[PDB]
Design a binder for this molecule. Structure first.
Ligand SMILES: *[C@@H]1O[C@H](CO)[C@@H](O[C@@H]2O[C@H](CO)[C@@H](O[C@@H]3O[C@H](CO[C@H]4O[C@H](CO)[C@@H](O)[C@H](O)[C@@H]4O)[C@@H](O)[C@H](O[C@H]4O[C@H](CO)[C@@H](O)[C@H](O)[C@@H]4O)[C@@H]3O)[C@H](O)[C@H]2NC(C)=O)[C@H](O)[C@H]1NC(C)=O
Length: 1161
């Protein structure tokens, strides 16, 4: 109860430290230490006077072999003053506990947070004031040092549950450690005690964190407090806290990233007061001991303190207000642009110009670190308002309508436009969306560029509010978007995806957006959805159905499907029942669009899908979809039992094959997710039919790849619906997961459909009832795309091809660039009072540049002289660390990786229609004789840099890569050759990397996927003098008329044994390929017209390898199939290897084909 006495002055020693490290990889730590003093005076019953006055801190980047808890003498540290004002403040007490603090208004919020952390260690609850219904058991106690209750205490990390335990202190411990009891004469007639607190962060009331994504963290807070005489009238002697955070840097590693912290107080003096502390000027309450936010863009301090501790909802003109990320609280708790050394507009301009200039020298992209610059730019523009964006756009003089993209002189301008467009697409704020809206309104972006812009918005928006969606709706109503067919689909799908992820799915609402910083994004009282949006889509669907336009119907069906609200069932009801006519493809799309309803409302979705299944009058491509969808809802045992029993009397082969394959393949699933369903499938197996179906029928299939060593499970779900006319199935479902622990990366799913394969084949052959309909969908982490098509687009395609051919006659220049990013941030305060930041980034690039000119002739000579460049890069960054606002510094431990592919090449295709000769030529271009073609490095590091400097970390003097002591280097090409390969791996014992590079073992696997992906590697594949090559790499391909002989077809014996035609194909010549063409086509010719495709791949130079190939067969319904073809003979002109592997298949059964494996020489 009475922790303190009136008229006494307590002096405490303050010690703390916060460090980051790479874990078991290295023993190098980066961080800071703090030393200070705390003075507390008890002047009244519930009024305390406090002051923290001495302040010193130092930065450490060392190796700590013994441990992070070791003492470091002041003679080994460079100490600096801590910019905190030693202004007195007041602590208000209630029932022996800390209630709130009173601080002068002219004090920064970060200082208030540090004081919260310091004072939170004086909070001892011995009488169970924060009762958790366990203090009643402790009530009948009298002089009992033992107590093991539970409570709910206050700390900078939040207001979370804490476990208590009290027991007396023995004299042996005190003798070993005099540090615990500085002055021991204060116990008087009592005894010493120990209090241990263990903090649980799972269940908790007040939470403060920032999130954006789509449990790997590990928090552990413990305390150790020693108190003097009595459990009611005592004195605090020492208090220490210890916290630890563990993160896997790249989501698939062994949890190596650490952040550690501690706070320390030891009593120094206690004596009667002589001079009192001055009263607090300009008082104001700071709430409880929990972290508080700030206004980043305000000139004066503005604290949101509960008495709702929540930042205001983002608007559509001003920047969002966050208080846990480096760009918002780095500069003394305020915005970075307030520094003066940083002007946002000029920084953005310089970064854009640098990125645009560096894209011309693509072979040096990894060296210059362009993609890291792109990420820095995207981070920087999230702190801009619309006025600043408009000023920047006007200042860079961008007018793509005026600019000519086809001119080689104007390349940097187009690159600036491209980089700026990509950066705004990835910004994700309100001003960015206003900028995009203004662009589309005026006409700066028209069809495909705008469709690409809209395709990425749902995957990059961070704060989807009501105003954001209202503006999106207003944009959807625009004449320009509505009239264009391609832009409309992208815009509508993105709108519906955002609606769903922001309002419908509670899991999406809570676990994907920073709710604990801004509150719930959309108020539950907003009836805008049901009164405005869904009726609009219903009207549009009705109009589209009336006019009989396939792509519009498909777009609105997908749009209503992706919402996932139960009202879409009433929306779809008139079409499903049969009052309104609809085709089978459209009905299948409607039934498959119900996927997100199964995730959110499993019972109702199960009811409707089972009702669809039980009907025997629906087409099989409806019921198969119903089966494939039901098993995503975890049915009960009776359901599966009845479904399995149904197979005996069911009269459809497709449905039975679907259910049997799904149930049988649902057995081997020994995973934490499908365990119960696997057991149910095992229990029901003994009732399925004994009939077996061919692989051409509809079948589902699930792959489980469980790896105990890697602790990662990879899944693979494949559903396809067979057809009664062609072997190729009509509909294909494909999905890839990647689960490690509990967190999963967003999945990649592909959907392909077509109404009739025979119709598609007939249209394809003609170019050289049920309408032709089809669509393709790719939904991955980067964008959502949907291409629906009808017969009109198929008939328009040849016109576009002819127009392109006639337009590239004189010569055309092309410049296509593409940039994509992926983000995931997680931030929360530590137990010292400082932000903790975790980031995971991926950046991609696909650049295709060069001049292309063609020619077409009445002789059908499609003569082309192409000249291209090809590039692909990928950067992956994973970082963990913390920020110190009082010096704008950021401490990072992480691993970065790179991958780079460059394809400088020149092509001359001379394909002739009358005679199937398509002779290519591949050259190295002039001035590019020596160039880099490959790069792959993985680099772990510890960094200590300044936020005001917007530069890649590789150029910062504080960064330190982890180079092993015994690093070595290898140059694989033994002597002079065409190719140069370097490996700069280290430790001479990685084995998995220096064995795949041996290139002398035949059994060695060339695949490098199976390797340790956490080590310093660096590989470069250069090229020395392959250029200036007059001799080309001939790639000549011939063709055959595919004739057949009737006498040989009749009375032709069929045997499983396969003969070898190698002696007949001894001559490896394209001209001699005509001689061998008759033998290959003639063999096994039973009313079949099969041609031969012979390629003569020839490589000139010092080493020549005349690789040859032959595919001579075709698929015919009348024929018995079985392809006899294939031989790869490689001859060295100097030392002939004569590697001549051959294959073949003459089974002629339509069931095992006998294939010869190899034959050497
Ligand atoms: C919370 O913070 C407080 C201080 O803010 C820490 O208290 C300190 O704890 C350390 C370690 O327990 C103490 O260090 C020990 O000091 C002893 C006395 O130092 C000298 O004192 C005088 C000079 O003033 C000399 O005349 C005398 O002869 C002593 O030499 C040392 O004897 C101890 O030596 C230990 O280390 C050496 C070298 O490794 C070994 O050879 C020894 O065998 C022995 O293990 C030791 O250095 C320090 O005194 C404490 N400070 C105070 C003010 O009491 C708490 O430890 C901290 N809490 C946590 C959890 O870290």
């Amino acid at each position: 109860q009475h922790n303190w006495q009136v008229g006494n002055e307590y002096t405490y020693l303050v010690r703390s430290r916060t460090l980051t490290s790479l874990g078991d990889l290295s023993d190098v730590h980066t961080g800071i230490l703090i030393k200070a003093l705390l003075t507390v005076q008890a002047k009244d019953s519930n009024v305390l006077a406090a002051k923290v006055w001495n302040g010193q801190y130092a930065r450490v980047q060392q190796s700590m072999p013994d441990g992070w808890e070791t003492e470091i003498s002041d003679q080994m540290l460079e100490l600096r003053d801590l910019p905190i004002s030693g202004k007195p403040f007041q602590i208000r007490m209630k029932h022996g506990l800390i209630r709130d603090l009173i601080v002068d208004r002219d004090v920064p919020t970060w200082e208030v947070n540090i004081l919260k952390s310091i004072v939170g260690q004086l909070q001892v609850d011995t009488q169970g004031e924060n009762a958790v219904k366990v203090n009643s058991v402790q009530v009948p106690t009298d002089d009992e040092p033992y107590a093991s209750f539970k409570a709910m205490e206050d700390s900078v990390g939040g207001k979370c549950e804490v476990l208590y335990d009290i027991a007396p202190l023995s004299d042996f411990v005190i003798h070993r450690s005099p540090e615990l009891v500085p002055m021991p004469t204060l116990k008087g007639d009592g005894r010493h005690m120990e209090v241990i607190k263990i903090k649980n962060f799972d269940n908790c009331d007040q939470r403060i964190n920032y999130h954006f994504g789509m449990k790997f963290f590990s928090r552990s807070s413990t305390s150790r407090i020693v108190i003097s005489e009595s459990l009611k009238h005592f004195t605090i002697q020492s208090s220490v806290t210890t916290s630890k955070m563990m993160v896997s840097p790249r989501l698939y590693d062994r949890q190596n990233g650490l952040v550690l912290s501690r706070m320390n107080l030891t009593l120094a003096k206690m004596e009667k007061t002589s001079k009192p502390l001055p009263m607090v000027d300009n008082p104001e309450s700071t709430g409880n001991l929990v972290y508080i936010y700030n206004n980043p863009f305000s000139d004066v301090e503005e604290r949101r303190v509960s008495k709702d501790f929540w930042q205001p909802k983002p608007t559509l003109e001003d920047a969002p207000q966050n208080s846990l990320l480096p760009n918002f609280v780095g500069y003394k708790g305020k915005h970075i642009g307030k520094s003066g050394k940083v002007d946002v507009i000029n920084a953005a301009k310089e970064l854009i110009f640098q990125i645009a200039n560096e894209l011309e020298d693509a072979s040096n992209i990894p060296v210059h670190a362009t993609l890291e610059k792109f990420m820095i730019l995207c981070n920087l523009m999230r702190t801009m308002n619309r006025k600043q964006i408009s000023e920047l756009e006007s200042n860079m003089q961008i007018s793509p309508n005026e600019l000519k993209p086809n001119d080689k002189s104007q390349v940097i301008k187009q690159n600036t436009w491209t980089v700026f467009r990509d950066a705004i697409t990835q910004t994700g704020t309100g001003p960015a969306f206003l900028t995009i809206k203004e662009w589309i309104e005026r006409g700066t972006t028209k069809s495909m560029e705008a469709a690409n812009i809209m395709s990425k918005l749902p995957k990059t928006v961070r704060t989807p509010t009501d105003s954001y969606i209202r503006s999106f709706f207003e944009l959807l109503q625009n004449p320009k978007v509505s009239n264009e067919q391609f832009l409309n689909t992208a815009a509508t799908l993105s709108f519906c995806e955002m609606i769903h992820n922001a309002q419908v799915n509670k899991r999406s609402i809570h676990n994907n957006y920073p709710v604990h910083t801004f509150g719930r994004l959309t108020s539950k009282h907003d009836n805008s959805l049901y009164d405005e949006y869904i009726p609009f889509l219903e009207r549009e669907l009705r109009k589209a159905h009336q006019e009989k336009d396939s792509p519009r119907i498909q777009t609105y069906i997908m749009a209503l499907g992706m919402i996932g609200e139960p009202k879409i069932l009433s929306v779809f009801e008139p079409y499903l029942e049969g009052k309104q006519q609809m085709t089978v493809f459209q009905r299948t799309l409607m039934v498959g669009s119900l996927g997100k309803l199964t995730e959110t409302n499993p019972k109702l979705a199960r009811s409707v899908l089972y009702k669809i299944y039980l009907n025997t009058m629906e087409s099989h491509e409806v019921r198969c979809t119903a089966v494939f969808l039901l098993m995503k809802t975890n049915p009960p045992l009776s359901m599966l039992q009845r479904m399995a029993e149904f197979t005996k009397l069911d009269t459809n082969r497709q449905v039975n094959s679907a259910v049997k394959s799904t149930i049988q393949s649902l057995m081997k699933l020994k995973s934490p997710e499908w365990k119960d369903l696997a057991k149910k499938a095992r229990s029901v197996n003994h009732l399925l039919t004994h009939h077996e179906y061919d692989y051409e029928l509809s079948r589902g299939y699930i792959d489980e790849k469980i790896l105990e060593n890697q602790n990662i499970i990879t899944h693979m779900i494949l559903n396809y619906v067979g057809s009664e006319d062609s072997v190729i199935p009509r509909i294909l479902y494909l999905t890839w997961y990647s689960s490690n622990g509990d967190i999963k990366v967003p999945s990649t799913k592909v959907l392909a459909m077509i109404s009739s394969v025979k119709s598609f084949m007939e249209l394809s052959l003609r170019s050289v009832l049920v309408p032709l309909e089809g669509n393709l969908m790719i939904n991955n982490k980067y964008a959502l795309k949907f291409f629906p098509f009808d017969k009109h687009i198929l008939d328009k395609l040849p016109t576009l091809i002819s127009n392109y051919i006639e337009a590239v006659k004189e010569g055309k220049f092309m410049n296509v660039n593409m940039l994509d990013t992926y983000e995931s941030v997680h931030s929360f305060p530590t137990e010292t009072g400082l932000p903790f930041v975790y980031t995971f980034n991926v950046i991609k690039l696909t650049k295709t540049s060069g001049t292309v000119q063609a020619q077409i002739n009445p002789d059908f000579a499609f003569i082309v002289n192409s000249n291209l460049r090809l590039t692909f890069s990928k950067n992956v960054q994973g970082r963990v660390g913390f920020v110190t606002p009082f010096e704008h510094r950021h401490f990072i431990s992480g691993i970065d990786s790179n991958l780079h592919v460059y394809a400088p090449l020149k092509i001359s295709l001379d394909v002739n229609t009358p005679k199937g000769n398509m002779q290519w030529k591949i050259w190295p271009m002039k001035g590019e004789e020596k160039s880099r073609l490959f790069h792959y490095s993985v680099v772990p590091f510890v960094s200590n840099h300044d936020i005001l400097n917007l530069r890649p970390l590789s150029m910062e003097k504080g960064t330190r890569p982890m180079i092993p002591d015994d690093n070595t280097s290898l140059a694989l090409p033994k002597n002079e050759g065409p190719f140069r390969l370097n490996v700069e791996t280290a430790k001479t014992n990685e084995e998995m990397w220096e064995l795949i590079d041996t290139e002398k073992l035949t059994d060695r696997l060339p695949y490098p996927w199976t390797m340790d992906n956490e080590r310093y590697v660096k590989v470069d594949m250069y090229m020395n003098l392959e250029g200036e090559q007059k001799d080309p790499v001939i790639f000549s391909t011939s063709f055959d008329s595919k004739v057949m002989t009737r006498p040989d077809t009749d009375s032709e014996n069929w045997t499983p044994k396969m003969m070898a035609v190698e002696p007949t194909d001894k001559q490896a010549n394209s001209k001699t390929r005509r001689q061998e063409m008759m033998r290959e086509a003639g063999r096994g010719i039973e009313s079949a017209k099969s041609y031969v495709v012979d390629v003569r791949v020839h490589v000139p130079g010092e080493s020549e390898s005349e690789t040859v190939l032959t595919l001579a067969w075709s698929e015919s319904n009348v024929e018995s199939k079985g392809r006899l073809l294939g031989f790869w003979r490689v001859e060295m002109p100097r030392s002939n290897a004569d590697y001549e592997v051959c294959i073949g298949s003459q089974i002629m059964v339509s069931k095992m084909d006998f294939n010869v494996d190899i034959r050497y020489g």
